Structure 1
């Protein structure tokens, strides 16, 4: 609903990614994430349901 979506900048995962550290997410192509921080050009902090962590920016497409 709207409370879940409000303020949220969404991302599409373009390629599967397997975490390589405890602060990284594992995701699949097609997953929809929320952007938390894009200040690092190589690594973006993201949110997926109850998880917050990093994925490489090359694996992500901004939707907003």
Structure 2
């Protein structure tokens, strides 16, 4: 995706947003991390969109 040098996060499972701030994502999506100040809900970006997701849906790739 667009920007370079970013950590990549894999979405393990589909997630359907429960509020307008949240993201809807599909298994296999690749995300970047915008803000984590807790281990449970993160602000992330996928394909030009930004929103909140539960961190349990994500695996850091390395």
User: TM over 0.5, yes or no?
Assistant: yes
In the alignment, structure 1 segments of 5+ residues that lack a partner are none
Identify the residue that residue 8 of structure 2 maps to in structure 1. Answer: 10
TM-score, normalised to structure 1, is 0.84
In the alignment, structure 2 segments of 5+ residues that lack a partner are none
How many pairs align? 62
TM-score, normalised to structure 2, is 0.86
Q: CA RMSD in A?
A: 1.6
**Which has the larger helix fraction?**
1
Identify the residue that residue 37 of structure 1 maps to in structure 2. Answer: 35
Q: Deviations over 1:16-43 (max 9, x none)?
A: 1000000001011111011111222110
Tell me, what secondary structure is at the counterpart of 1:55?
Answer: strand
| Structure 1 CA distance for aligned equivalents of residues 58 and 13 of structure 2 | 8
Q: Deviations over 1:41-61 (max 9, x none)?
A: 110110112211111000001
| Structure 2 CA distance for aligned equivalents of residues 54 and 10 of structure 1 | 16
Tell me, what secondary structure is at the counterpart of 2:2?
Answer: helix
